[PDB]
Amino acid sequence: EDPPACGSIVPRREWRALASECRERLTRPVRYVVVSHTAGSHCDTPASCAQQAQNVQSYHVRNLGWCDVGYNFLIGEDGLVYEGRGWNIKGAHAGPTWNPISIGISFMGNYMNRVPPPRALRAAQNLLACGVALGALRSNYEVKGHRDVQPTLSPGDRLYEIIQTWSHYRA
Amino acid sequence: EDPPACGSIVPRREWRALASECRERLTRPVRYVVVSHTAGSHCDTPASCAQQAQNVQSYHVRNLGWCDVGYNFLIGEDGLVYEGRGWNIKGAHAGPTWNPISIGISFMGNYMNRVPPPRALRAAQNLLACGVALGALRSNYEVKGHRDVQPTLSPGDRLYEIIQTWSHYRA
Amino acid sequence: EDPPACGSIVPRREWRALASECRERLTRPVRYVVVSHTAGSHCDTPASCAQQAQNVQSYHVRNLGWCDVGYNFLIGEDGLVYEGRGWNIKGAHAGPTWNPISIGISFMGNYMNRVPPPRALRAAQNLLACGVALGALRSNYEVKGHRDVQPTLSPGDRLYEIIQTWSHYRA
Amino acid sequence: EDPPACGSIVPRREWRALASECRERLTRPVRYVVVSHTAGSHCDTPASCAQQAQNVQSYHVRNLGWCDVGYNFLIGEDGLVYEGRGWNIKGAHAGPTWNPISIGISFMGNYMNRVPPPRALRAAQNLLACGVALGALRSNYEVKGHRDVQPTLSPGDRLYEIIQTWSHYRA
Numbered sequence A, B, C, D: 001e002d003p004p005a006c007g008s009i010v011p012r013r014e015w016r017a018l019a020s021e022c023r024e025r026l027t028r029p030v031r032y033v034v035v036s037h038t039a040g041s042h043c044d045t046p047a048s049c050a051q052q053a054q055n056v057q058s059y060h061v062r063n064l065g066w067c068d069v070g071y072n073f074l075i076g077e078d079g080l081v082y083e084g085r086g087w088n089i090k091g092a093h094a095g096p097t098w099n100p101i102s103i104g105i106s107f108m109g110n111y112m113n114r115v116p117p118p119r120a121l122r123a124a125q126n127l128l129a130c131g132v133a134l135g136a137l138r139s140n141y142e143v144k145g146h147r148d149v150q151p152t153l154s155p156g157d158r159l160y161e162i163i164q165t166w167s168h169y170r171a
């Protein structure tokens, strides 16, 4: 029974989320990770990224009339991880086959032509390491890109390239 | 006031679609139309567009393991309409809420920072008139942008702007 | 918002209900509809159902000491909707995690082994459509069984099977 | 096989109606609503009211030799609405001047010495609201009583009084 603090995660309170209204739950341990980009603009400061997180959830919540930001987590270019729906709540990020069986982490920006900075990559890698220590993810979890399970350009070409490389990436 | 009074459409046999395997049906008349873009490349001849439609199909069926190409109808900048799942089959284009109550029409190409040629826009408007003529769509149907319903950049800044002038666009 | 009135709801005064003492409001628009059964007697006439409404409220106020009938609405085999706590007041129908965030409509009877008549089902879905028309319910509202959010047989085997069938039903 | 009938209209098949052989259509949007009475027996349960709708249609078809029950809709004191000829098919309720420019709805009973229960009056207004939404009625529809248009004691003195207090009524 180990309690670690791998959570260097910015809580929703800290980026000033609107109250989530989602109630459906994931079953631990989750087996799949789906990587996305927002396709939107990036941020490289804790301050600008809290704005970017609020903007993204605002779109999902107010325009799209959803129960919260779709992702389980957002990764920023400031090297920080933004608690989305977090580990226990079913996301809305890859459609009805994958949503119940996966975590959706998404990078804030458009990686069709940029590559994300090493510290975003590190954040993401670290987040996954956390999930495993927590029991949230299977230690042998698989990683898919967003375009691999759904018809989109997301996560972007350069990022898609990078994630194809990853240890836990699969087909 | 007699039968088939609408729509010039390239059938599946004609662009060499793989066999549809979709069973689920739409209940007509249909209220909503969701406008899309493929985000991929465009095509300006019957030759290349009949070619594009297969790519798209190929991707949705082979890579994603779907029963058929996700859209009900594809528009080409050749100025023709490629038959997707068609008027009667539930499509896969807008997630679980919009799919069973709408028709997904996808303009082949990426219209973030280019426009479809007048001929493409006519194909699609004409298709819509045709859908009313056949009682496949309600007379007072509503047009939505893909992004009004899913987090995506589709149908692209340029198209999105154009479709908002449409007689049938509702927010 | 928009004045056009809705549904054929039998008002409290009409079924001779005791006064409500409930004071808590529900934030509009509401996202969830929770469907339950009364597990009490059924009725099939406006006369016998007004009666039924009364015993259920009577049993809720007099015995359980709640402020009012626990449901937001009651449905008769009558084919009519009985006004319970209404659109605006928080119910007592699915526990504290689910009360503040949903409408509870209960069918009057025991549907483990009986099916409700078309008449009842129409009234129910109609009531929901008004919710939407009035802005009490989200356009994208979600219907859940009682069974899905608490450990109970409610709303009975047969009726549960029917609501699984509805457009707005969610896992 | 989609969402049902605003106003909880009882379908033809549900009250066991002889098949219609009417063909004249009604030009939507219709402006007028003539309100009549049956001048037959009333009914106050769904069981007795389906039986009554059945009786009056049988009289109209078998005896008078009409193509269907003369009314577009019938209202029971069970407080339900019985689909007659419906929104689209010209009625036979108010003679040649008025049949092609009217929905005619009839209360089942004789309202010379009786008033209909508020549930019937509610059912009737509800049916009208659902007329506009559908687009079968001009949003600014005008209501007349049967006797304002043909020489007759229908819809009965007691009911006629009520009708006059309605907002959309024009002497």
Ligand SMILES: C[C@@H]1O[C@@H](O)[C@H](O)[C@H](O)[C@H]1O
Residues within 6 Å of the ligand: A092, A093, A094, A095, A096, A099, B094, B095, B096, B097, B098, B149, B150
């Ligand atoms: C992506 C998709 O979006 C909406 O249509 C639905 O809310 C669904 O839950 C989600 O998976």
